[PDB]
Design a protein around this ligand. Structure first.
Ligand SMILES: *[C@@](O)(CO)[C@H](C[C@@H]1CCNC1=O)NC(=O)[C@@H](CC(C)C)NC(=O)c1cc2c(OC)cccc2[nH]1
Ligand SMILES: *[C@@](O)(CO)[C@H](C[C@@H]1CCNC1=O)NC(=O)[C@H](CC(C)C)NC(=O)c1cc2c(OC)cccc2[nH]1
Lengths: 305, 303
């Protein structure tokens, strides 16, 4: 038993982190087979970052301008290209530690593990959630750009995030492994503000199911509700609306506990309208929204990879 | 900026996780060099676990009784010894993925990272703290015995915990890599209780410093307190006393924020007596104590 913020093992992603340096600008890159993926602003200097033209700056660069380093071993760049805000560099060596992988664009609320890297050297690992406003409440310092977020399924590593920005409010923003930003942010040295955040309803419900599984079920009521009526009420409390995919992934926890998705919704809808009246769930009076139904299943069922 | 429960990368440890099987009992083992470490209750049957005479049960075992599997390969046990509750299995092959490692006994309040494994396969990683009562609030299911906790310094892995037991309260207990249990627990199949837990004060103060570094300052105040007067209130609320060493370890965080330790203590004392109202610190409604000054300094340096 026990419920904690659990991250996937990072062994597979560690062997793919490399250091990409252009001039004096250095960040982390992802070495998959014979291609290294990294943020494109590495070709930028301190001043160009203010207002850059990446297409203009890239034409002035050649393969020999890029320094790719695995440890202290250089990987000669034999080709370069730009896809959105991500830069792709072909190297002369196929990563012998390349795992079965895939590129995926996660959804708001979905969780992933972040491998904090600095100078191509992994330093820490932690789990985080893609907030409804397309930001992540992570932990990043200078030199963390290029750090990737991932999910481990079976033996495939599904890369879904590459770090780029830290907003003024302390949150962070990035793109997928195809250079496409999450949210309306841009890779420029500018103070950008994200939209108002909301509570991830699907995750709060998965937390409730985690409680019901652990004998804590006082919050269950004899009420039910429609998916539409619940979503309209949930928005009045800063709770993200539920989707078809949300109801589906809540199935396993629904069958295991025997409580229908729409029954738990009415139970959560009551917790929002009347409060908690003291008391707590899983020992905490604060509703947690950064545990997906999978995180509840994986951690309560010991799923390995 | 930002603060998050961060664990060390588990790559160097994943290459050492194997599966040990004896009869109908299976658990995880740690393969370092030509040796494999695992809990000794793997040699026990469902009946022996109730009251195991491990010395007796061990001598009645042979090398071929232990099935050590490393992925799709089986390791040949050419020897077996016992060091307290840890069973040392010698094999014919040396683990090439064996990193530079050391065996250390963690202290209460210190933190380490746990690599949860089931059947010799890593399932997840998280950071946890050795509670003052020598338990840990981890996440372990059946087949988790053999999982190890560790800290990494440069490229040297410091092993300090091997999982064994889940108390009836839902907490977890285990031993260091020398087989010595943390706390007054024994590896028998009995319901065991731990001593009354206390809060790691120095970790709470460090976590408050992390909150201030990240823009949270509502709990601060103008008052200041003496070390003794703070400890009097801390002990009253079941908080570990703050030592002059603890004050020194907090120095770097006090300089970065400009808030003196005894000034932070005044805030904590007020939080203990008045509560947190409906407010939160770093997204939490409870005073966190599973972050050491080092863990805070690592994430908040330069911010
Ligand atoms: C990468 O290391 C760049 O390689 C960092 C990541 C941040 C450093 C501290 N913590 C981080 O998460 N990214 C940057 O330094 C750039 C990214 C651009 C060039 C794509 N800048 C910012 O993140 C940035 C810029 C501003 C700003 O404009 C001056 C105002 C407020 C915040 C801010 N953040
Ligand atoms: C190992 O996986 C066994 O190989 C297992 C892991 C824990 C149980 C589920 N979660 C865990 O973290 N450990 C045990 O089952 C140990 C075995 C001992 C060391 C031989 N025992 C317990 O966890 C245990 C026994 C009892 C008990 O008695 C009977 C009464 C109440 C709780 C309890 N836990």
């Amino acid at each position: 038993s026990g419920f904690r913020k659990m991250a996937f093992p990072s062994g597979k992603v560690e062997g793919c982190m490399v250091q990409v340096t252009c001039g004096t600008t250095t960040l982390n890159g992802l070495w998959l087979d014979d291609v290294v993926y990294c943020p494109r602003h590495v070709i930028c200097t301190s001043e160009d970052m203010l207002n850059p033209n990446y297409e203009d700056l890239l034409i002035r660069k050649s393969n020999h301008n890029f320094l790719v380093q695995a440890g202290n071993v250089q990987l000669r760049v034999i080709g370069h290209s730009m896809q959105n805000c991500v830069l792709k560099l072909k190297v002369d060596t196929a990563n012998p530690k390349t795992p079965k992988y895939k590129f995926v664009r996660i959804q708001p609320g979905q969780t992933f593990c972040v491998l904090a890297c600095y100078n191509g050297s992994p330093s820490g690992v932690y789990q985080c959630a893609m907030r409804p406003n397309f930001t992540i409440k992570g932990s990043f310092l200078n030199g963390s750009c290029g750090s990737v977020g991932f999910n481990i399924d079976y033996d495939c590593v599904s890369f879904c995030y590459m770090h780029h920005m830290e907003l003024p409010t302390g949150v962070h923003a990035g793109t997928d492994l195809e250079g496409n930003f999450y949210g309306p942010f841009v890779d420029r040295q500018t103070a950008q503000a994200a939209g108002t955040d909301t509570t991830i309803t699907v995750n709060v419900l998965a937390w409730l199911y985690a409680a019901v599984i652990n004998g804590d079920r006082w919050f269950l009521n004899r009420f039910t509700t429609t998916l539409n009526d619940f979503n309209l009420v949930a928005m009045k409390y800063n709770y993200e609306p539920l989707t078809q995919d949300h109801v589906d992934i809540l199935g396993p926890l629904s069958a295991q506990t025997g409580i229908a998705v729409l029954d738990m919704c009415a139970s959560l809808k009551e917790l929002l309208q009347n409060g908690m009246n003291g008391r707590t769930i899983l020992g905490s009076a604060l509703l947690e929204d950064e545990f997906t139904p999978f995180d509840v299943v994986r951690q309560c069922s010991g799923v390995t990879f």
